[PDB]
Amino acid sequence: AVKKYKPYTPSRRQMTTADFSGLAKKRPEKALTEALPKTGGRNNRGRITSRFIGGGHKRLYRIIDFKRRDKSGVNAKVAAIEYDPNRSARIALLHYADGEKRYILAPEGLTVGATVNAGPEAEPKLGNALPLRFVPVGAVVHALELVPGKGAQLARSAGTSVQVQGKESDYVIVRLPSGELRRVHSECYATIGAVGNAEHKNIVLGKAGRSRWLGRKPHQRGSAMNPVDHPHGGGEGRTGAGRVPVTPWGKPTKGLKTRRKRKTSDRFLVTRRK
Amino acid sequence: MKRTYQPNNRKRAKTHGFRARMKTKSGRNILARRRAKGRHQLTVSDE
RNA sequence: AACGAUAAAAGAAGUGAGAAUCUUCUUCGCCGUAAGGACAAGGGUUCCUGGGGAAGGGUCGUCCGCCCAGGGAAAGUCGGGACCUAAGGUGAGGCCGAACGGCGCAGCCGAUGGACAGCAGGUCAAGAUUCCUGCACCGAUCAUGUGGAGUGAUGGAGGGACGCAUUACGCUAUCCAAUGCCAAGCUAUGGCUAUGCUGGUUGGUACGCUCAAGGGCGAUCGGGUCAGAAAAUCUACCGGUCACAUGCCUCAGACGUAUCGGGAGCUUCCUCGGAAGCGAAGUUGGAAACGCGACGGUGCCAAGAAAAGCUUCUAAACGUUGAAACAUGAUUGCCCGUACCGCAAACCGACACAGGUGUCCGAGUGUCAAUGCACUAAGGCGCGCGAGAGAACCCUCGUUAAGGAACUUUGCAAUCUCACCCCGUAACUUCGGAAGAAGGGGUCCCCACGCUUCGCGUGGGGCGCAGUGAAUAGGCCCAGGCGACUGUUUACCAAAAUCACAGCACUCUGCCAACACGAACAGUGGACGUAUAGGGUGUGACGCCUGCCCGGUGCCGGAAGGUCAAGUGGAGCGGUGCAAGCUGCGAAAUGAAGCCCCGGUGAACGGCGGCCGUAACUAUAACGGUCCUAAGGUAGCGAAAUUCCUUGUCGGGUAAGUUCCGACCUGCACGAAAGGCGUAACGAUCUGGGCGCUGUCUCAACGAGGGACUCGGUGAAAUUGAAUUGGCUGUAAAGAUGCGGCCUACCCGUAGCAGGACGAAAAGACCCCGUGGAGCUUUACUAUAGUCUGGCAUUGGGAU
RNA sequence: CCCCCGUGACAGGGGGCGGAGGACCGAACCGGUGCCUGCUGAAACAGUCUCGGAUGAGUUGUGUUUAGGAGUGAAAAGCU
RNA sequence: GAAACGAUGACUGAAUCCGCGCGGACCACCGCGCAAGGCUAAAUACUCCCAGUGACCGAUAGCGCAUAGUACCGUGAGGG
Ligand SMILES: [Mg+2]
Ligand SMILES: [Mg+2]
Ligand SMILES: [Mg+2]
Ligand SMILES: [Mg+2]
Ligand SMILES: [Mg+2]
Ligand SMILES: [Mg+2]
Ligand SMILES: [Mg+2]
Ligand SMILES: [Mg+2]
Ligand SMILES: [Mg+2]
Ligand SMILES: [Mg+2]
Ligand SMILES: [Mg+2]
Ligand SMILES: [Mg+2]
Ligand SMILES: [Mg+2]
Ligand SMILES: [Mg+2]
Ligand SMILES: [Mg+2]
Ligand SMILES: [Mg+2]
Ligand SMILES: [Mg+2]
Ligand SMILES: [Mg+2]
Ligand SMILES: [Mg+2]
Ligand SMILES: [Mg+2]
Ligand SMILES: [Mg+2]
Ligand SMILES: [Mg+2]
Ligand SMILES: [Mg+2]
Ligand SMILES: [Mg+2]
Ligand SMILES: [Mg+2]
Ligand SMILES: [Mg+2]
Ligand SMILES: [Mg+2]
Ligand SMILES: [Mg+2]
Ligand SMILES: [Mg+2]
Ligand SMILES: [Mg+2]
Ligand SMILES: [Mg+2]
Ligand SMILES: [Mg+2]
Ligand SMILES: [Mg+2]
Ligand SMILES: [Mg+2]
Ligand SMILES: [Mg+2]
Ligand SMILES: [Mg+2]
Ligand SMILES: [Mg+2]
Ligand SMILES: [Mg+2]
Ligand SMILES: [Mg+2]
Ligand SMILES: [Mg+2]
Ligand SMILES: [Mg+2]
Ligand SMILES: [Mg+2]
Ligand SMILES: [Mg+2]
Ligand SMILES: [Mg+2]
Ligand SMILES: [Mg+2]
Ligand SMILES: [Mg+2]
Ligand SMILES: [Mg+2]
Ligand SMILES: [Mg+2]
Ligand SMILES: [Mg+2]
Ligand SMILES: [Mg+2]
Ligand SMILES: [Mg+2]
Ligand SMILES: [Mg+2]
Ligand SMILES: [Mg+2]
Ligand SMILES: [Mg+2]
Ligand SMILES: [Mg+2]
Ligand SMILES: [Mg+2]
Ligand SMILES: [Mg+2]
Ligand SMILES: [Mg+2]
Ligand SMILES: [Mg+2]
């Protein structure tokens, strides 16, 4: 489920580790293994836009086509469930009966070797490419596009499930994992099931290092900084605030709606993530 | 302890040189505004 | 004053105008995971020869890294380019932007990497996988042949192609042993006369049915069109079929044989010492890599660059009587870099400077091992002032009678302790730990005996004060405060209680995501991530927990109404000309967000408090406690990092305790994620006590080394009105050597002291002043990026 | 992983074997904990002795990117 | 400010002769004028350079220089 550790070192107690005992051990396919360099958070101007990014371990991209519509109407069989360091989830290896291999995202349960399909003409099985309209009411799914062909941008993190509330017009209502209700153009695609990994959410990190190894340079209380540096700075003691909680940029954190008030999305969200 | 100036030929040239100084406007400007002061030392290319 | 580390020098010989310093010789002293050797970066002729001596050299110099002149550096195979790509930099068209310009796909530049054909020896005063000798390899073009029909890209696939840690067998380097083999001479000073002493003991290439651990490894037929634009002997899926052990395959390496070298020395000539010829052996045994066999095995989560060369298919295309492939001969071999210094006197430090500088090699003995310590080898030095003295004082070090923390701000400093083995080891605990707790005992030499060795246990003997005998080598414990922890921090006065952290919590964010850089509808990070994600904020393991106040501020939500800008609408007012008329001004209603207003919200901002009376002179050590704002402290803590009164009161320890520990509660002024209270472990943190040890101390002494002092050599500094510069009392702008009076005092210097010269150093950094400045702050003022918002333009048809 | 020992509602306990770790002692390397010396230094920040990490958040070479109300900062207004 | 006029950024974009524009709000009168198309020597400014002069300097003057942007400092711009 998760490996644990006897307390032989101080930090080797709470520490916890994944269960990769179901990972088809394999060096990911060569003609699918692009090269990701890291970006300190600096952009093409060399200034840290994102903030607090740094190093960790060398990583590579595995192309994971999300629009299965490039090969729907035929099926492939699962070949392996290797380990991507860039995703919160696990990924799986597709052997299309007609030669071409691909990589797709791996869902919850889907045992190594199950032969899965793609096309509107597909059984609600785990791992099928299926349009959202042909999906049963109340069914469990992930990997949802905001338009046909675009690419699956919904339900991708570990153990996530967008849930078909049901059809309507040509826009199917949907339950986002955040707790939101979204209209989706029924010619949008889907992949049946929960994401899996699932266990992820729970692995205790355990020590500084473990943060570093995923490349998350140490985070910083502005309450450390000085006036010159950032808002909450100054003081003579472990000091409070003296103003309302606020980002470095002074635009309040803690209870301040930040979404842009006018938008085109505003007539596709029937409810709010509350 | 250890000092400010640790020479690096490639650095020196790729930093202060002539292809470099001409690559930018303000370096053209540095150039001719040097020339006027009768520099023999035009540029670290001329070392 | 200083001559730049306390690694150390002597005598002889020589040269010269002159020598402690330069050159020979013989010793001595220091380095030896270096203070040796080889590179890179940097420097630039510092290299070698011959010469010079003004200045550079911390003295001297006849000498030099300085001066002069002349020489020296050689590559198809090393390194870079003629090949490749990473980050990054670029970049026609392309996307933007007051200008200059900012972006940006392909392509191109870009080594720190990929790729890649040569090794062994010899020698100039000075080069060396270059030159020379010996034997190789690679590409290129031609020719005689085997030719005798296919060649195989600007696209396809394969391959190149990669992490950390641990580890099995084989082996090389390379080092040790010896009555192995070869060579050399000798008898020392009592002995040894060799079974002693010293030295050397295989490098390349070629073959060879010789030995070999290790390592990679399948194959062929067919189907599917729909996979690689298409093609397709290929590559990928599906299926069938094939003697599991394997053989197929490779050969690090060793053994043999041969050949080319090299080899201790030996000889011969001879000119501050070299030129030239010659040449023996080639053994058994053991150790052993971070190297090779290798892209081996296993385990692990943090999941490990790209591209060309390369290998395979096909497209066009010209060929299919000259297509590839091959053997051999010819022939060809571009471009820069190669000297020398390169852990330093030659680079960076202004210096021939106790600093800084990246990778490799880095022998032996002793030592559990080792790049550790002592001593050494090869090699490299004795650090470019010397000599004597043997006072104060100063630095670094030894020893110490009696005592043993009496020192003191504090055991600061310094001693103790010290390795390996064997016995043994506490509260407390998160069951890992504390822990090397504590505390003991052993350790050397010989003989016998056993055992798995170099090795070790056992038994008996031996010696000295002592046997990790020299060097490298933990003092320990009890009890608190703070943080949990490993980490981080103020380059050059603060290393912690800071900060980070794993953990938890509030919110924000549904993708052209928020958020952030931005001439800007560019492009970028966020992210090739997707709510188990991303941002921001706060607390800071873990454990039991985290209460009371929504009135003010903030925030979320609400809508009746109060409202509010431009714009819409203009009744009415007036200026004017005779005038149609032009026009100045401008009211109603309507009208955006936002504020007023209603409620919700604390792991948002915050809040969780005022007071009552005492005999006397306008007063001091003390009182028990009812309690106005929205509420007025729940747990736990409490004289604390918080305590005013203050050395609070009590207890412990002490002979004696403002400190410390426990309790007490009257908390000036603790309190729950600005966390509350705990807690094992961790700590160059902080605080008190102990044991041990000690010159920290009583109280200092003797000794040593480097200074200080003397002599010969070179010779600074900050300061400086000018001085021919006493003391006491007094006076003076109030601290007098200079004025008064009185005392005292012959001229000069040397080593020493630090009272004075309000001593030197920086126009005081505290304080006041300046309608001086800069940083920072907010509900001080004003704008303003940004951002919300109505109208207007992009901006269109229609249905009701 | 592998054996024997254990069955009160109980994860367990011994032995083998294994090689884990912001484990430990400790050179190189990285850092500056205390004292003294140095303060017209040997050096515009160091020397000796002592001390901290020493497979990790480690150390370092090379090419390269970000800058002035700007960068960068495990936060000192430090560093540029 | 009574704000004429030109001038443009965004919205609007009239008359062409019995017409258009101005005369410092605005109106009549009465005057000066031809927007929406272009070129144009001359006088004027400067002085790296050439020459002539001087109640300008003569070696701390005079340019920074009797010459040198060199020596020297600076990673650089730059100082000199
Ligand atoms: Mg945090
Ligand atoms: Mg601070
Ligand atoms: Mg401060
Ligand atoms: Mg601020
Ligand atoms: Mg503040
Ligand atoms: Mg002296
Ligand atoms: Mg000296
Ligand atoms: Mg001496
Ligand atoms: Mg002689
Ligand atoms: Mg003579
Ligand atoms: Mg000498
Ligand atoms: Mg060396
Ligand atoms: Mg010489
Ligand atoms: Mg001299
Ligand atoms: Mg002579
Ligand atoms: Mg560019
Ligand atoms: Mg290279
Ligand atoms: Mg090569
Ligand atoms: Mg090469
Ligand atoms: Mg050759
Ligand atoms: Mg081995
Ligand atoms: Mg012998
Ligand atoms: Mg004798
Ligand atoms: Mg011998
Ligand atoms: Mg290319
Ligand atoms: Mg050279
Ligand atoms: Mg010297
Ligand atoms: Mg030096
Ligand atoms: Mg070695
Ligand atoms: Mg050794
Ligand atoms: Mg040593
Ligand atoms: Mg030398
Ligand atoms: Mg005498
Ligand atoms: Mg004594
Ligand atoms: Mg005694
Ligand atoms: Mg001490
Ligand atoms: Mg125990
Ligand atoms: Mg012990
Ligand atoms: Mg005895
Ligand atoms: Mg004994
Ligand atoms: Mg010690
Ligand atoms: Mg700490
Ligand atoms: Mg400091
Ligand atoms: Mg310090
Ligand atoms: Mg409103
Ligand atoms: Mg008491
Ligand atoms: Mg705290
Ligand atoms: Mg620490
Ligand atoms: Mg005491
Ligand atoms: Mg003298
Ligand atoms: Mg007088
Ligand atoms: Mg007098
Ligand atoms: Mg003195
Ligand atoms: Mg002053
Ligand atoms: Mg460690
Ligand atoms: Mg540091
Ligand atoms: Mg106008
Ligand atoms: Mg003169
Ligand atoms: Mg002059």
The identity of residue A259, as a single letter, is: R
3-state secondary structure of B5: coil
**Which residues have CB under 7 A from strand D?**
A 8-12, 15, 42, 45-48, 207-210, 212-213, 217-218, 220, 224-230; B 1, 8, 10-11, 14
Cα A211 to Cα A205, A215, A219: the distances in Å are 7, 7, 11
Secondary structure string (H, E, C) spanning chain A = CCECCCCCCCCCCCCCECCCCCCCCCCCCHHHEEECCCCCCECCCCCECCCCCCCCCCCEEECCCCCHHHCCCCCEEEEECCCCCCCCCCEEEEEECCCCEEEEECCCCCCCCCEECECCCCCCCCCCECCCCCCCCCCEEECECCCCCCCCCECCCCCCCEEEEECCCCEEEEEECCCEEEEEECCCCCEECCCCCCCHHHCCCCCHHHHHCCCCCCCCCCCCCCCCCCCCCCCCCCCCCCCCCCCCCCCCCCCCCCCCCCCCHHHCECCCCC
Which domains does chain B possess?
A: 1-47 (1.10.287.3980)
Q: Tell me the C-alpha distance between A255 and A260, whole Å.
A: 15
Judge residue A249's burial from the number of C-beta atoms within 10 Å of its C-beta, 0-12 exposed, 13-18 middle, 19 or more buried: exposed
- b/e A195-222 (16+ beta carbons within 10 angstroms → b): bbbeebeebeebeeebeeeeeeeeeeee
C1' of C526 to CA of A231 (Å) = 22
The identity of residue A274, as a single letter, is: K
Cα A265 to Cα A93, A168, A180, A270: the distances in Å are 35, 18, 13, 10
What are the respective helix, strand and coil percentages of chain B, to the nearest 5?
55, 0, 45
User: Residue with structure tokens 């205790």?
Assistant: A204
Neighbours of ion ligand 1 (CB under 5 A): A 219
Q: Tell me the C-alpha distance between A115 and A128, whole Å.
A: 10
Q: How many residues would you count in chain B? A: 47
Q: Tell me the C-alpha distance between A204 and A206, whole Å.
A: 6
| Residue A138 neighbours by CB distance under 10 Å | 10
What Å resolution does this PDB entry report? 3.0
- The answer to whether the Cα torsion of A121, A127, A133, A137 is positive or negative is positive
Q: Of the candidates A198, A154, A188, which has an alpha carbon nearest to the alpha carbon of residue A2?
A: A198
* Strand C bases with any atom < 7 A from protein Cβ: 41-43, 86-88, 90, 100-101, 103-104, 157-162, 224-228, 236-238, 300-306, 347-349, 355-357, 430-432, 484-486, 492, 498-503, 506-518, 523-542, 553-557, 604-606, 674-675, 680-681, 775-779, 788-789
C1' of C389 to CA of A35 (Å) = 80
Backbone angle region of A194, left / alpha / beta, with phi > 0 → left and psi within -120 to 50 → alpha? beta
Contact at 8 Å (CB) between A64 and A91?
yes
User: Does B11 contact strand E, using a CB cutoff of 7 Å?
Assistant: no
For ligand 15, the distance from its centroid to the CA atom of residue A21, given in whole angstroms, is: 90
Contact at 8 Å (CB) between A256 and A262?
no
Give the determination technique.
Answer: X-ray
Q: What is the DSSP letter of B8?
A: -
Q: Tell me the C-alpha distance between A154 and A147, whole Å.
A: 11
C1' of C171 to CA of A59 (Å) = 38
The phi and psi torsions of A181 (rounded to 5 degrees) equal -110, 115
* Strand D bases with any atom < 7 A from protein Cβ: 20-23, 45-46, 56-58, 62-67, 71-77
A80's tokens: 């392996």
User: Residue with structure tokens 């450390």?
Assistant: A224
For ligand 18, the distance from its centroid to the CA atom of residue A115, given in whole angstroms, is: 51
Q: Tell me the C-alpha distance between A199 and A196, whole Å.
A: 8
C1' of C246 to CA of A231 (Å) = 76
User: Residue with structure tokens 């700075």?
Assistant: A233
A140's tokens: 């469990």
Contact at 8 Å (CB) between A127 and A136?
no
Contact at 8 Å (CB) between A159 and A200?
yes
